[PDB]
Amino acid sequence: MDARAVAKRPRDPADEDNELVTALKAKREVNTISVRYLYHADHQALTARFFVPEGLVEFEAQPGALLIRMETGCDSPRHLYISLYLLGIRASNVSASTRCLLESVYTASAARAALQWLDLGPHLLHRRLETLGCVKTVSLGITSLLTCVMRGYLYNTLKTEVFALMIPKDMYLTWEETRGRLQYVYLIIVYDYDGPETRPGIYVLTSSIAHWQTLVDVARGKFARERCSFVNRRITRPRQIPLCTGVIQKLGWCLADDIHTSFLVHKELKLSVVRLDNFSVELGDFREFV
């Protein structure tokens, strides 16, 4: 170590020639493969590749769909990858007309299998779900390939276009009149304990609050009826041991001015969505509240 070594500012990652160019220059050998520029070499987002059967890929052809991993309770597929739209079928929050529309969209054996597996078991819904991230690609086929980011912005190969996050309009939720400049977005699953069986509500919440306790206090204010239902079931129906009235999972952050309303088209049917233009994913785990 010496003074000049300390003074020297670090090398620019962009002005050093890459390893392949280094080797070719060292031997002074030509190659057919273009090598001077490496694509995705400066993508800071972390991505993964997922295989999914043809029946499940609908409304996820467009980039920006939220991707969930669901448990089948079986050893043959073990896990399936489904979108928030498919969960729209099961959620009580979604209206009748939209439910009919996106139920007519998912008329495939795989989607119906997913629904049967979801309703079959005795567990609560959130125990069967694991969130992966947002998708931005599609290669269609009998088995389709989806690439999903799990930490970062949504953009194509050259960053020449940034993708948004699409939320169906019935699931979108806000609790403040004037938005804070920075918004955090959360996934909420809340259970209503009626007589026969629990009806789950599914929401995506955009909020300025980052503290857990304040956020959960606001949520308990907004969902008082479901807490009353939880206590009522605890009283009337012993030997049923419910847990939780709802769970909250954090996934992402975006600016308030990026929020917009839009529609999605698939097989000449229009679904209306809320659109988070420059959304960047940052996943948390399910935290439960009562």
């Binding site: 896990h79 694991e130 930490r151």
Partner: protein
């Protein structure tokens, strides 16, 4: 240019078989008690805490405080350990008893059950890497038991 790493020197003589054993573990999660630049091999692993009158839950409490690091490179006279940073991707070895799936969330647990690097009185006791629901089930079952 190098990346930042932590150096570990073995205070015991190593045969070729021992170093050949170490290089098999070139991506395992090694717990370390303190963030320190140079350490001796006794500090590696959980063997330093092992006790006859204490058990699982105290080891869990201690593992809460330890620093997790990944073994990066094996050489003569020294070991290179890399301490991971939040938000970056890394390669880890499934030393646990259970297979993994894409999207799984893993958490570290004390081992419950081949032995690695039996030196004169020290052993490389690595922890368990397990998906979260299994860890919850194990904790509840053990507490009830």
């Amino acid at each position: 240019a190098m990346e930042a790493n932590i150096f570990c020197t073995f205070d015991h003589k190593l045969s070729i078989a021992d170093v050949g054993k170490l290089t098999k573990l070139v991506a395992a999660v090694v717990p370390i008690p303190q963030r320190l630049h140079l350490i001796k091999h006794y500090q590696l692993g959980l063997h330093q805490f092992v006790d006859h009158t204490r058990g699982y839950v105290r080891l869990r409490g201690l593992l809460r405080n330890m620093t997790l690091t990944l073994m990066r490179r094996v050489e003569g006279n020294q070991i290179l350990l890399h301490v991971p940073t939040h938000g970056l991707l890394y390669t880890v070895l499934n030393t646990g008893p259970v297979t993994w799936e894409k999207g799984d969330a893993l958490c570290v647990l004390p081992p419950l059950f081949e032995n690695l690097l039996t030196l004169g009185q020290w052993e490389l006791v690595l922890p368990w890497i397990v998906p979260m629901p299994l860890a919850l089930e194990i904790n509840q079952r053990l507490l009830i038991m």
